[PDB]
Structure formats: C-alpha cells, structure tokens
Amino acid sequence: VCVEVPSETEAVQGNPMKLRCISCMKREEVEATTVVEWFYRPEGGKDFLIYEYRNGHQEVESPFQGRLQWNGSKDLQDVSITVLNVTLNDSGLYTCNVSREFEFEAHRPFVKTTRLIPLRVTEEAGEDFTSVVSEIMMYILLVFLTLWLLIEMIYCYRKVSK
Amino acid sequence: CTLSPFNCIRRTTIKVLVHPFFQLFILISVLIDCVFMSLTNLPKWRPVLENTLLGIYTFEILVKLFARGVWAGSFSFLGDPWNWLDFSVTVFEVIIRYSPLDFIPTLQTARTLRILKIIPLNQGLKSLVGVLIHCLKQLIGVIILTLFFLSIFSLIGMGLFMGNLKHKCFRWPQTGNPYYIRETENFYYLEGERYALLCGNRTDAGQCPEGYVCVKAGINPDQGFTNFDSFGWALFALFRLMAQDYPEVLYHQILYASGKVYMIFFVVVSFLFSFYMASLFLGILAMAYEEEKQRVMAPFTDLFLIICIILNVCFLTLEHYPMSKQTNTLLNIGNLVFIGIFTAEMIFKIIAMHPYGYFQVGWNIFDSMIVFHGLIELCLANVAGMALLRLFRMLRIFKLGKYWPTFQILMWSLSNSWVALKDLVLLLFTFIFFSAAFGMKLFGKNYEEFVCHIDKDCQLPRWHMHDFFHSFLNVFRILCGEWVETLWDCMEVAGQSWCIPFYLMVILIGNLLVLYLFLALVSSFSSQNIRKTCCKIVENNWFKCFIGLVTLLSTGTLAFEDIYMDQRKTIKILLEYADMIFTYIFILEMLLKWMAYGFKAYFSNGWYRLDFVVVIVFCLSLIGKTREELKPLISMKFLRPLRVLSQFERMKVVVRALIKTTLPTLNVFLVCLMIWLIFSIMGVDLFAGRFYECIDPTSGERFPSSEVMNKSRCESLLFNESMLWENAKMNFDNVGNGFLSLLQVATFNGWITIMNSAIDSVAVNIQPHFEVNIYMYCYFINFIIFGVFLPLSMLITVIIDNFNKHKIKLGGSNIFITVKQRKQYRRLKKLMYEDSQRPVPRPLNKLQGFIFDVVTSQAFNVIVMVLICFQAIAMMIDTDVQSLQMSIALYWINSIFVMLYTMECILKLIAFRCFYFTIAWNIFDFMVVIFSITGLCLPMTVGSYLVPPSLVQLILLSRIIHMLRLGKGPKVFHNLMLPLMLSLPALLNIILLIFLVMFIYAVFGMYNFAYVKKEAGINDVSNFETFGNSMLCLFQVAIFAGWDGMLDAIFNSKWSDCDPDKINPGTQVRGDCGNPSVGIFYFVSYILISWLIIVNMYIVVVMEFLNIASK
C-alpha cells in the first residue's frame, strides 16, 4: 500500500529529522530498477548530492558523511532519509530526485519524479498553529456544552419546584 | 375418423390397451432404451436393440391409434398432446432408418425425446405436469414484467457502458495454441490473466502502467460474450445479473473500464431483479401451490445409553490427520467398547421382549442394523480393504435421534408428505436425465471436435458434455446457478444459435421444478426535586434529538480511518478531539439517566446496558492512546455504532422483530448442525490427508502426475529442481476444516476447487491424478441435496411460521414498522387503491376557442403512451460499431422526440390554466422536457466541456416510468408493483439495519485487512483500503459473489507469502499479512447475520404479496 504524503518542513535543534519522500508506481505488480539521489543546497550552495541508491547503497563523501541514515523500503518505493543532530546552520533545500525504468519485453519506459523539501530548523519550534486552535475549539465547545446543561438544569429545577 | 366401438378389432385393441401388463411392458422397454442410449457406451448390438425398440414403439402407436380412434376431438389419439410427440418421433425414425437419407446424428438426438415418455406412463407425473402448466399460465404477467424491466435496464446499460469493455492500455509511444495467444507486445497483460487489463481515464477507474495509455481498441473480454455494445448482449448481461451468476468478475470489469461510481447501477439491479422480481415469482408460485392443495432394566437407565451415544459421536469427531499410533489405537478401543455396549443393548432387549416383540418397532431395526454393521466391520475390515464399511459408522449418530423430539417430528412430516414429494422428485429426476442425454447428443461431438477452442493443450476440460456423466453434472450445476462459465464453452464449440435455447430451457424449467419442490417441502414441514428535574431533562424530545445527532456523528466519523489517514493531517486532529467530546457527552447522558431513574431501574433495562457498554468502549478507547502496551484497546471503538441501535425507535423494532422471528429456530438449527457434522465426518474419512500435492513454488501449478508419482520424488531433491509438497487451502483434514469446506460448498463460492481436489485424490502420499476418482461427485451432490436444500426448507418454514404467529399476536399485518408508521401504511394503501377523482375545471369564458377536451381525451393519452414506447424501441437499434448514417438517424429520432414532448408540454400548459404544476407527475414531465432541451442544444452554442452522447437518450427514457401507472399502462403492472409500495416502510427499516451492520463490519475490516497483499479476491476495486472499497466487498459477500477469493487472499500467511515487516509508505502500520482466525470469524459471522436479515426481507415482501392477492 502506498499513499504519497509530504514531509515535515520544520525541525528542532538537537533532534533527528526525517526528510520523508514517497514516490510510488501507478501499478504495484510491476518491477523496476530504481535510481535514487538526494541533493542539499545552502543559500549559497549549488545542489550537490549527499546520498544515492544505484545497484545498492553507495558511499558518497560530503559534509553529511557519517550522520545520514536510510529509512526506505526494500522495494525502494519509499526513499525517506534521516539526518542526525540537525544543527541550526544546515537548512534550505533538500531534493529527492528519483528515476526508475521498467521492463516489458518490448519497451523500457523511463520516468523521473522530483520532490523538494524546504527545511528551516529553529532553536525551539512550539506547538503547531493548527493543533493549538483545535484545542481552543475543543475547550470552548466543552465549556459551552456544560454551560447549556447547567442552564437547563437550573431552568427546569425552578419550573418544577414551582 | 375411427372404427366402431362395436367391432372385433377395436374391442380387442381396447382390451390390450387397458391391461396393466401393457403399460408395464412399455415402461420397461422405455427404461431399457434410456439406459442403453445414455448411460451405456460401446456396445456392438446397437442395430438389433434399436430396431426391436422401434418395433415395440410402433406397436404401441398402432394399438393406441386403433383403440382411441384418430380425431374424435377428445380422449382420442390426437386428443392427448403426448401422443403427438410419440407419433412424430416414431415416424421420423421409421423414415430415416429405412430410407436413402442418413440424418444419423440428428436421429439419435431425436430419440432422446423418448425419455419424456416416462411422464405419460405414470399418472402421478402426468397430473403433476398438468398442474405445473396451470401455474405457468398463472406466471404470465410476471414474466412479461420481468422482460419489460430487463429490456429497460439493458437500454440503461448500453447508455452507460457501451464500448467500455473495449478499453485497454495501449503501448505508447509506438507459436502455441492459435486460440490462446496474448498480444503482450501491444497491450498490458497481468502475469496470469488471459485478457488484456481493462483501464479507464477517470481517477476511480483502472490505472495503466507507465509507458502505457488507455485507448478504446481491440476485442471485448470473455471471447466477446461480455459487453454492452448492443441489445441482445446487454440482455444477456442483465439476465446473468438477475441470476447473480458469476457477477463479481463483471463488476470488476465494468468498474475497471469505467469508474467505481457506477456500482449504483449494480446495487439497483440487485434490489430490483434478484430481490423483488424473485419475490414476485416466489409469491405467485406459493399461492398456486396453496390453491392446488386446497383443490386436493427399562426405567431411567437410558441416560447411560444417551451418554454412550454422545461419547461415541465425540470419538467419531476426533479422527483427523495426521495421527500417531497411540491416538489411533485409542479410537480403535473406543469403537470396541461402544460396539460391545450396543451389542449388549440389543441382546438384553431381545431377551426382555421376546423375539417377535423386538422387531415390531422401527427404532429397534435401526439399532440392530447398527450392531450388525459394526460387527461385520470389526471382522472383515482388515482383509481385502473394504474401506467404505467404515464410512457408515456415522449412521450411529442418527441413534441420538431416538430421544430427540424435534428429529422425530421432522421425520414424521417427511414421511407423511412422502407421497406428494415422490412425484416431484421423480419429475425432477426425469427432467435432469432427459436434459443430460439431450445435451450430450447435441454437443458431445462438438466438444471433442473443437476441443482446442476451450482448453489450451487441446485436452477435454473439467466441465463438458462429451459423455453422459459430465452431461448430468453440467445440468445439475446449471440447476444450482453457475450456468455462465460453461455456456461460454458451449457457444465456443457449438455456437450462440444452438446453445442459448437449450440452456434457457434447462434454466427456466429447472427453476420452475426446483422452486415447486421447495415450496412443497416447506408446506410439508409446516403441517431531591433535582432528581425529577433530571427526569424531565432526559425525557425531553430535544434531548433525544441532540443525543441522536451526536450518535450519528460519532458513528460516521469512524469511516475516515483508512489508509489515507496520515495524509489528512488536520482531520486527524479534529477527530482525536471530537472523540473526547463524544465521550464527555455520553458520560453526561449516563450520569443524568442514573440520577433520573435510579441504578436499579437503569441496569434493569436491556437497551441501557448496551448504552453502558458503549460508554465503557469509549473510555477504553481513550485510555488506549497513552501506552503502546495499551494500544490494542483502541480497536474496541469499532463497537461504537451499536449505540445507533439503542437510540432510534426504528432499529429497536427491527431488532425486536428479528428476535421474535429468528430465535425460535434453535432446535431446527441443531438438527441441521447434526446433518452437517455427519457430512463433515464422512468427508474427513474420504479425503483427510489426501489433498496434498507437489506444485511449482513460483508458478504454483500442480506438477504433471507422470513425473512426480508420489511424495518421495517431490521431497527428495536429486537433480536440483524446485518443487514444494504442500496441502490445499481448503481441505478435509479434520471436522473443522470440513465445516469450512462445506460452508464454502453450500454458498457455491469456491466449491469447484474443492471438488477438483476431491476427484483428484488417490492416497495419503500419492500425487493426485486428473479425474481419477470421478464418482466422489456423489458426495457433493448428496450434500447439496440433503445438508443444504432440505435444511433450508426446514429453517424457512420455521421462520415463516414464527412470522405468522407473531402477526396473529398483534392482529397487525406488519411488525417491522413503528407505531407512527402504521398510519403511513394505511395512507399508502389508500393512495394506491383509490382514484384521484380530482379533475380541474376547463377554462370557458376568457378564451372560448380553447379545446381543453383534446388533452383530457383518451386518444391523446394513448398516443402519448405509444410515443413513449416507440422512443424506447428506437433505442435498441444503437450499437458500438455503427455506420455514420445510422448515428445521425438516431440523433434525429431523439431530436424529434424532444420536439414532440415539448409540443405535448406546451399544449398541456395551454389547456390547464396554471394547474399544470399541481400534479406531481406533470412536474416530472416538465423537468424531463427542460433537461432534454438543455442537453440537446447545450452544445449548440455554449460548447460546454461536453454533453455525453447518451445523456439526452437516457433523459428521454425516464418517461417510460409512466407504464407503471394505474391509468396509463397495463393493469397488471400496477398490481405487480403494489407489494413494493405497500412494504416500503418495513423494507426501509430492514435496509437501514442491514446498512448499519455492513458499516460495523466495514470499519472492522478496514482496521484488519487493509495492507493485506493483493491476491485472488483483493484487487484494485474490491479491497478493505477505504470505506467505499470495504462496503463494495461486503455487498459482494452478501450476495455470495466470491467471498472465497477474499478469504483466500487473507490466508496468505498460511501460504507463506507475506512480509511481516515491509514498510507501507505513508502509514505507521507495518506488515503485509492477515490473521486467518480473524478472517474465518469475520466472514462466517457476516454470512450468517446477513443471511438471516435478508431472509426476513424476503419473507416480508412475499407475505405482503400474498396478503394483497388474498383479496
């Protein structure tokens, strides 16, 4: 089962970050030969790669040597990559450029599907905006419901006792 | 012309005719002909026997001719229609045999007709055929109405699906058996499938692989027989859908080519045809049967014996596979002990009641037979083999029936109606035998001649009509449904023009006979003031409505928990908080009810206990999301929709009624369980351990038995070849596997696989060989006859009896409706039995030259109706491959009909001075006109995205719904629609309950069987990935449309093909496997529950029909 979902663009200093990347085939009966490449770009960078899968995981010297991890699938249908101890400086553009080719005994289609990730780590990222407003909604609704119950209890007590 | 009733020749001929030796002689000769023409093969004496029989038949013709005369008008030779058949066949044979012509293959076919002579030689069968003809004449209107609706929905299907099954996935950018090639170089083919993969451009339609594009091109699937490209083949598809025959493949094909949103067509077709038209046929036939019937040492020690019998049944149930020596000798010694006990029983009873005394009663004979068989097995078992003697030990389970009051009364009913059941059974057997022989003579040469058309490797297939046994089996399968796959082969070898009539004859006449036998069996078996403040709050009508809204919302929010859950980021948070809100509301309700009523009153109510357990379920679900150890509690929330049961008065009446009708069926259900256990033990005996086979681990097909002669070859790798020795998914290794196999055989899903295994078994380690044990088919035919067909009559008769009883308990026709709905029922009964008698006054003075009369004339209405019918007829001429002239011709016909309906509407608007909008049907016609004009000339100027070419055609067709109106159509159609419109309330309630149960099971299945690898029954359209997919799967299961593929896929773990750790991208759930135990429980429970509710649906509609007809 494959469902494409974008990666989180926010990381917190001192933790690990998962640069999710899901690129999956229209049909899952089909086999392919997948080539995966990850690129990184500082504001002054030139998009140099930091990882790649080609006939197996390769070793690619870069600033990221030694603190990069693989969290993909055997079928190379999820090519997510994890970074350790994200520091304040490392940020910007991460590129999951994936190209695969199929076999059909008559033709060999080629496809490339790019996926880019804007990463901005910060000193302390607080609770995301959506969750906080959702919690406020829950609290106001809970209070209003209990208030409505209290109001009608008082109302009906008055009416009954009279 | 005749001869004198006073003449020596006529007198002697009459003397011979009425002498019973004559009728017996002819009967015996007929049966000899039957055997030696059908069930026997390869004699050398054929000419002598054939000519002797021809002489006997000619003598019969001459005698009966002279005795009766020729054309006295009645009770003469030509008075009896059977004599026409006899004379025709006899003369044809006399001609062919002794004439230059050699219509030889044709001749033998004709001879098969003499099998039907068995009917006029038996007076019981003759009378039965007469009454059957009378009932068939009673079925005329229902047949016509079914034809009407099938034609209408064939038009609807062409409008929606024409050409779709030609969709393929074309490759873009740009030897063997000649009848089994695959154009893999141009279109995409799945690994194993024969036909190109269907695919569509909608997002809810089949998707192409990469480097492929979807273009309509090529041939239809199933050799061209499955398609909606023309009337006729659309009628074929809709008739296959009425019968619900192999429908799941058609569903998959249509929902691949087009979108999954078209499943409404199939749901509506099911409801209208498989449910309602079948209910009408059943009601007509049951009423006809009713009309015909109205026209016509001793004391208190037996506890020891009953315990001994029960323990013997337990010992029988314990034999399985594999088995050691200790657990085998244990069972041997048990057999010894029990047979000794029963021998002593027989001896002592013989002593006490002197010998004639013993055999005066019927149960003593059965017990003596038990002892006699047991001893003659104990001895003689070891030598010579004779393994079938053991197979009769299960007869001892029937001893348990001597103390069973229910088994006795059931057997009593059977025996008391035996006389009438005998004629029906004999007639059905005669028809099956004649049909098998007729089909063999018609199509056996064709099956052998064009064999390569229906089997790669050009060997005869598993189902055919080359010889008589397979002909008999084919007809028997046709009588169970299952007539579509073999019809394709028939037409491939013989042709459309010949197979379709024979198969229709079998289908229709077999259905009539089987339904009549079923009705006969059923009819045989029938014979602090704050406290009061809280009480005020809780009972208020608005509090109930608010809590009901909350229940509905809480239920519906469960449908969002599908594979796309992590993709919907904000919905996830909203739902997580709404769960707490719902919990709070329901806890407040519990506390308020506690305060109002008082714990004793609270827990003393059944429904409030259900509420309380729902509250516990909410709380447990909440606490589960704190520790991954406590995570498994979460799933409990899927019990939540049970709240819907306790909050709505409708669900409560439906559950009450289901309890009142279907609970008293416990004793009969126990009898049926005993029958199934007998058959399961038999099947374990016959088949246990024998379904093992050596297959190719990857390809999965059985190795040819000419190489892997047994297990030792398979297991022992000596030439480094891959080959795995493993069991079958559905086997008979113990009584539990037996029960699963037998359920799979009783619903006819996956039964071909099990019987294929059965008729291929040899020994316990020997490779199975193709159709080497062909007579085991007798096992499954007997099971279907005795542990499926007869139990069904038993159960249904009990349920009908409870229905009628509880109706009498109320003096009210309907029990599935609420009190508020009885007034609705009365109102509907008034409307569809009463004339509107509400005409309008004709404008006179404002505009004299104003002929109101024309519109209200009968002539105008009848011309309008004929126009509707012609519009419908002109639709049938459309096809997929069509000329350019025909296309424009049909376009202009539709345009002219739009024009003519517009003229109708305008003239009516003139006639009624603004009362036109008072009548609801007039609004329907007005909307039809407006939408038709819109669509017809919407692409004239606006040039919208597009107007589908068939949209205007379909819009115009809706007006034919006018044929079901009292004044504007045949009077029968209204009468045959009355039951639906009178049972609409109860049907609504039951359908809502069915939807609720389906919803619960869909949510549970979403939780369980998503992420299970896609295999036989799990594919793109039917799976448990979303709510719609799961509901499609459950609907498919409810009609028995292939639930065996679903379970076969869920059993992937049994088959050792799944990765318990594969990452599923975009979801935190890991794994690819299923739980077979959960799968079995799931499907068995759903099958039982859905069956019970649907059967009650049928009972409701049929009882309503009977009530209406009773007036």
Ligand SMILES: C[C@@H]1CC[C@@]2(OC1)O[C@H]1C[C@H]3[C@@H]4CC=C5C[C@@H](OCCC(CO[C@H]6O[C@H](CO)[C@@H](O[C@H]7O[C@H](CO)[C@@H](O)[C@H](O)[C@H]7O)[C@H](O)[C@H]6O)CO[C@H]6O[C@H](CO)[C@@H](O[C@H]7O[C@H](CO)[C@@H](O)[C@H](O)[C@H]7O)[C@H](O)[C@H]6O)CC[C@]5(C)[C@H]4CC[C@]3(C)[C@H]1[C@@H]2C
């Ligand atoms: C796609 C395209 C579109 C365009 C188009 O093509 C397709 O569309 C297509 C649609 C085609 C029409 C379809 C239909 C008809 C009707 C047919 O002829 C009447 C149909 C016959 C069928 O009758 C049976 O009806 C039931 C069927 O199950 C049988 O079952 C009973 O079985 C038990 C035993 O009796 C009962 O106890 C159960 O209760 C009961 O179920 C019943 O025995 C049997 O007789 C005769 O009809 C009777 O119907 C009533 C029954 O006798 C009677 O009514 C009475 O009603 C009151 C009685 O209570 C009395 O007081 C009233 O005086 C009295 O009127 C009356 O005798 C008479 O009307 C004439 C041809 C036509 C116009 C077709 C022409 C071409 C089309 C227009 C096509 C066209 C080309």
Ligand SMILES: CCCCCCCCCCCCCCCCCC(=O)O[C@@H](COC(=O)CCCCCCCCCCCCCCC)COP(=O)(O)OCCN
């Ligand atoms: C006093 C009031 C009287 C009122 C009576 C009203 C009765 C109304 C009935 C109420 C609703 C009934 C529900 C529907 C009953 C019809 C069911 C049936 O006929 O048999 C079913 C049971 O299934 C069968 O296998 C029956 C097939 C018959 C096989 C022929 C056996 C006949 C045995 C007689 C001996 C003949 C000798 C032949 C030798 C081989 C068929 O299954 P299905 O088509 O509904 O769905 C299955 C799809 N997977």
Ligand SMILES: CCCCCCCCCCCCCCCCCC(=O)O[C@@H](COC(=O)CCCCCCCCCCCCCCC)COP(=O)(O)OCCN
């Ligand atoms: C097989 C090729 C057919 C392909 C083309 C189809 C052409 C349209 C045929 C239209 C026939 C019109 C009558 C339709 C009534 C169908 C009855 C029916 O199937 O519904 C139920 C009601 O049917 C009955 O119980 C009684 C039917 C009696 C009517 C038949 C009268 C006999 C006609 C005698 C002449 C024979 C005609 C031979 C043609 C030369 C039983 O179905 P089932 O659910 O049990 O199917 C089991 C598979 N799940």
Ligand SMILES: CCCCCCCCCCCCCCCCCC(=O)O[C@@H](COC(=O)CCCCCCCCCCCCCCC)COP(=O)(O)OCCN
């Ligand atoms: C006794 C009843 C008599 C009633 C007779 C008339 C009843 C209605 C006839 C069916 C009208 C359905 C309208 C659907 C529009 C025409 C189909 C179509 O092709 O247009 C689009 C259809 O798309 C849709 O709107 C979704 C399909 C809706 C399916 C509706 C099936 C229901 C039919 C049952 C009618 C009876 C209803 C009974 C209610 C209980 C797609 O266009 P396309 O084929 O050129 O290519 C699209 C892909 N690129």
Ligand SMILES: *[C@@H]1O[C@H](CO)[C@@H](O[C@@H]2O[C@H](CO)[C@@H](O)[C@H](O)[C@H]2NC(C)=O)[C@H](O)[C@H]1NC(C)=O
């Ligand atoms: C699915 O959509 C594609 C859209 O391109 C259709 O292919 C084109 O159809 C048009 C006619 O409408 C042709 O003139 C083009 O040459 C086709 N090719 C393409 C890729 O443009 C295709 O026919 C549609 N298929 C189905 C079965 O609906």
Ligand SMILES: CC(C)CCC[C@@H](C)[C@H]1CC[C@H]2[C@@H]3CC=C4C[C@@H](O)CC[C@]4(C)[C@H]3CC[C@]12C
């Ligand atoms: C309430 C709304 C939302 C849902 C409506 C869908 C209805 C019409 C669907 C869902 C389940 C279906 C039923 C499932 C099983 C069978 C058995 C077979 O003999 C045909 C009729 C019958 C009985 C179907 C009739 C139509 C049905 C009731």
Ligand SMILES: CC(C)CCC[C@@H](C)[C@H]1CC[C@H]2[C@@H]3CC=C4C[C@@H](O)CC[C@]4(C)[C@H]3CC[C@]12C
């Ligand atoms: C399942 C679908 C596709 C088919 C069902 C069509 C039925 C329900 C339609 C077609 C014919 C209709 C009836 C025709 C006649 C009248 C007269 C007037 O008093 C209005 C109601 C009434 C009584 C209609 C009720 C609904 C009706 C019975």
Ligand SMILES: CCCCCCCCCCCCCCCC(=O)O
């Ligand atoms: C072509 C094969 C014919 C199959 C049907 C048998 C035809 C013979 C006549 C059957 C009906 C006879 C009964 C007439 C009415 C009655 O007696 O009640």
Ligand SMILES: CCCCCCCCCCCCCCCC(=O)O
């Ligand atoms: C009253 C029953 C009549 C049944 C008649 C309908 C027969 C259904 C099959 C018709 C298919 C027509 C074949 C046309 C030629 C072809 O396209 O190969």
Ligand SMILES: CCCCCCCCCCCCCCCC(=O)O
């Ligand atoms: C896991 C099992 C699911 C099914 C549970 C169904 C519970 C139904 C409860 C029925 C209570 C009956 C009370 C009737 C009271 C009355 O009729 O007055």
Ligand SMILES: CCCCCCCCCCCCCCCC(=O)O
């Ligand atoms: C209540 C009735 C039950 C009757 C059950 C009948 C089961 C019949 C089984 C037939 C077995 C045929 C075996 C053929 C011999 C062989 O092995 O070659």
Ligand SMILES: CCCCCCCCCCCCCCCC(=O)O
């Ligand atoms: C060959 C196609 C003809 C189509 C026209 C058929 C006539 C219109 C349909 C309405 C039938 C009217 C019957 C009313 C009387 C009755 O049957 O009780």
Ligand SMILES: CCCCCCCCCCCCCCCC(=O)O
């Ligand atoms: C939208 C939620 C769907 C949940 C699935 C189960 C649907 C069953 C709901 C039953 C409601 C019955 C309404 C009764 C009408 C009334 O208020 O009188």
Ligand SMILES: *[C@@H]1O[C@H](CO)[C@@H](O)[C@H](O)[C@H]1NC(C)=O
């Ligand atoms: C990536 O894989 C490693 C090793 O299996 C594991 O320890 C780590 O937690 C994984 N990270 C994620 C985010 O799955």
Ligand SMILES: *[C@@H]1O[C@H](CO)[C@@H](O)[C@H](O)[C@H]1NC(C)=O
């Ligand atoms: C990250 O690196 C800094 C500097 O070496 C170290 O102090 C800190 O503990 C590290 N954190 C992790 C995630 O290992």
Ligand SMILES: *[C@@H]1O[C@H](CO)[C@@H](O)[C@H](O)[C@H]1NC(C)=O
């Ligand atoms: C980030 O950039 C600054 C300036 O370019 C550099 O001093 C620093 O070393 C970089 N990252 C870290 C924190 O190592």
